[PDB]
Amino acid sequence: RSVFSERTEESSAVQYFQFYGYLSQQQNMMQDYVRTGTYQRAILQNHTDFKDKIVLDVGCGSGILSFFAAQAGARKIYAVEASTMAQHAEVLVKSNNLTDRIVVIPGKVEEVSLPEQVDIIISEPMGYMLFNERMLESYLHAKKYLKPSGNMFPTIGDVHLAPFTDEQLYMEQFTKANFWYQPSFHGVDLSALRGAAVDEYFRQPVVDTFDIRILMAKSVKYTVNFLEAKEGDLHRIEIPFKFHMLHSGLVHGLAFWFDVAFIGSIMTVWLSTAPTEPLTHWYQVRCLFQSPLFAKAGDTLSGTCLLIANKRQSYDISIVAQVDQTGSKSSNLLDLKNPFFRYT
Amino acid sequence: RSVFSERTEESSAVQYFQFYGYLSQQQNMMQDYVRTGTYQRAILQNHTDFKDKIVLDVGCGSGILSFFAAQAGARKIYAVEASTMAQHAEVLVKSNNLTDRIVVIPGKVEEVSLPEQVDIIISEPMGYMLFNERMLESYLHAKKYLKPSGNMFPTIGDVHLAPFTDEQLYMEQFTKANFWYQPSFHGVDLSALRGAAVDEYFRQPVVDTFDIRILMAKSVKYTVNFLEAKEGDLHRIEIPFKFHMLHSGLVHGLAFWFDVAFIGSIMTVWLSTAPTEPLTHWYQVRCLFQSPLFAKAGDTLSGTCLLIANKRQSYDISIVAQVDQTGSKSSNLLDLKNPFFRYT
Ligand SMILES: CNC[C@@H](O)COc1ccc(Cl)c(-c2nc(-c3c(C)noc3C)c(C)c(N3CC4(CCN(C(=O)OC)CC4)C3)n2)c1
Ligand SMILES: CNC[C@@H](O)COc1ccc(Cl)c(-c2nc(-c3c(C)noc3C)c(C)c(N3CC4(CCN(C(=O)OC)CC4)C3)n2)c1
Ligand SMILES: Nc1ncnc2c1ncn2[C@@H]1O[C@H](CSCC[C@H](N)C(=O)O)[C@@H](O)[C@H]1O
Ligand SMILES: Nc1ncnc2c1ncn2[C@@H]1O[C@H](CSCC[C@H](N)C(=O)O)[C@@H](O)[C@H]1O
């Protein structure tokens, strides 16, 4: 019985920690040079935030970020990891001669014991669309170990939302679902399921990158301040929007990306997953509208993106939007945990 | 609770039925024309095995195989399905005006109650490498409903294994593993994890197709007779082999494929996933040796492939092989549940 277990269906947790138990998965994240290189730079260039300090690494995986904290001179790093990756992290701490400075604690950060409070918490808890995984709440939970006035790296996260037009992506959903619109598939009329097939595809956020020319308005930003936020703040995330359209066309949905900032004593370093920046393993995420909206340049597209946390380590997404000048409206429900990994 | 839940981790079962509850997944199987067309032919060309008979469809999915039994004149078909796909199958039965003949029964075949015994059981229970999923055991379990001298479609299954040489595949996997050979990844020594990393990558069976020129010896065949086997026969599957090498070179592992036969009263119909036959959504499956074996034409490669059923709806594979002429041995352990889907 913990904060984690009460928040999470055991079946989801098992699958989740199995996934991170593979060295190939740790390797996928490590190999993202923009990510891993930026974390390293953020920590090393802010060396005074680490020199002789006590550090907590929330979800250490291979231990990579803890090693950077050590390169920056930290005195003691508690590296907490809930998957079977904890044993491999331990092998690396030993082989890198760091047993006196990095202590791997196997288990959930919501369940383990730390022997002292820490000066700074480091973590990479970001899912696709930022919020997938609900590991941001683990990272916030971890502040129970933080000395008053302690820091967190990353310090803040921004999600960006912007409307897009992408007629080809939109038409691809019907193309796929029209498999079911056959009156005699081997003698069987499949047609009655075509609607259900359309709904299935539209419920999947599309994880992939895209050309910035699809974007039809300046993005709106929603910020989580990790120093100030409480876990409960991530249970219901309401993002209102009021887009002033830069281009006329059919709006087929909303595009999402995120940035995080490491606000150190020496400098602020940003890690961005924006479509204007080099590609990362996070890509970007698009949520389609099953009913597209016509807008002309100068119109306002208003509505809300509401994310409601669920016990499958993710969110139910509800996007409602309207063009203010016409009143035409579109309402959409998506299951963040089960997206379309279109980049594959 | 049931035979099923006793042998199945809940976390595995949830993920498994979630996978099959997607229309897109049913479509993937349905669209395999060799598979679906062969099933239809097996059923329709053996019409006297269905005409005025009672049928059980184990894991009906969309209902496709039940429609084929109805086409062949079956009096009653019980279509059992444990995923949420059952609700879509009922929609199709109504829209195809077959409410009087196809009765969908939601639930596990191990847990439902059927109104009567059946003349014939149809299913498509084959996983990749035949044995993945442990659905063969559900199919065998279902014989509790089979009338004396009832039939099974498919009736028998043959797994084939043959040694192969494929330096490119071996090096592709080896190269991924050797990320963990780096002594200074961002200044961190990962090398102590090299052995673990090689073990992990080589533990993954490789699902994809290949040119038959890679095969180094005639296949060994192991047959499961579905009419005769008991579910317990599938807990421990031991396949000895003695290959008479036809070509000299490095044996990089064993290649696997399978055929099933529908042995009806009118004719036998074969469905094959062999690499000498048109490609199916099953592809083929290769288990690599991390330590390849050198063999000369005329040598014998002998050993055992042992499959031990596990609670994750799959098998722990051990392959021990040796070149008899030199005493060169290779021992390997593979996790069938977690393969490398190389064909993507
Ligand atoms: C704490 N966050 C750590 C971050 O570095 C993870 O960043 C990402 C970035 C992009 C993605 Cl697409 C993922 C990310 N997430 C999750 C995930 C997780 C975790 N929890 O729920 C879900 C869903 C999953 C499952 C995931 N992948 C499944 C995947 C794509 C489809 N596959 C495939 O085509 O193989 C044939 C199998 C491998 C990659 N990727 C993670
Ligand atoms: C009862 N057996 C029904 C048969 O029709 C299933 O036949 C196959 C044939 C080949 C594959 Cl490679 C699979 C088969 N199996 C299992 C499976 C299952 C089920 N239980 O444990 C496992 C593992 C899984 C997960 C699975 N896929 C994951 C996958 C990776 C590649 N994909 C992709 O790139 O785009 C989505 C699609 C999703 C394909 N495919 C099934
Ligand atoms: N509640 C929790 N407690 C402990 N570890 C957790 C956790 N939730 C997620 N994790 C772990 O956090 C890691 C996130 S992936 C990032 C790993 C590593 N810090 C890196 O930057 O490369 C995974 O290894 C996952 O198993
Ligand atoms: N123990 C069990 N009881 C009931 N259904 C099962 C089962 N194990 C697997 N299934 C179902 O069996 C189906 C196998 S896929 C084959 C679907 C369909 N008969 C066709 O040939 O196209 C899946 O839908 C899966 O959910």
Numbering used by the authors:
A (entry chain B), B (entry chain A): 134 to 477
Source paper text:
CARM1 (coactivator-associated arginine methyltransferase 1, also known as PRMT4), catalyzes the transfer of up to two methyl groups to arginine residues on protein substrates. CARM1 has been reported to methylate over 300 histone and non-histone substrates through which it can mediate effects on many cellular processes including transcriptional co-activation, RNA splicing and processing, control of cell cycle, and cellular differentiation. Originally identified as a co-activator of steroid hormone receptor-mediated transcription, CARM1 has been shown to interact with several nuclear receptors including the estrogen and androgen receptors, and it may mediate oncogenic effects in cancers driven by these pathways. In this report, the discovery of a potent and selective CARM1 inhibitor EZM2302 is described.
Several rounds of structural refinements that focused on improving ADME parameters led to the synthesis of EZM2302 which was found to be a potent inhibitor in the biochemical assay (IC50 = 6 ± 3 nM, n = 21) and maintained its selectivity profile over other histone methyltransferases. The crystal structure of EZM2302 was solved in CARM1 in complex with SAH and revealed subtle but important changes in the binding mode of the ligand and the protein when compared to earlier compounds. Overall, the position of EZM2302 is shifted 0.4–0.8 Angstroms when compared to compound 2, resulting in an extensive, water mediated hydrogen bond network between the pyrimidine core and the protein (bottom). The addition of the methyl group to the 1-amino-3-phenoxypropan-2-ol moiety alters the vector of the methyl amine which results in a direct hydrogen bond to Glu266 and displacement of a water molecule. The chloro substitution of the benzene ring is accommodated with only minor changes to the protein and π-stacking interactions with Tyr261 and Phe152, and Phe474 are maintained. The dimethylisoxazole moiety makes van der Waals contacts with of the slide chains of Glu192, Tyr261 and Lys470. The spirocyclic moiety makes additional van der Waals interactions with Phe474 while the majority of the substituent is in a solvent exposed region. M, EZM2302 IC50 values varied less than 3-fold. This noncompetitive pattern of inhibition with respect to SAM is consistent with EZM2302 binding the arginine pocket of CARM1. Synergy indicates that these compounds bind different pockets in CARM1, in agreement with the crystal structure. In fact, EZM2302 is only found in CARM1 crystals with SAH.
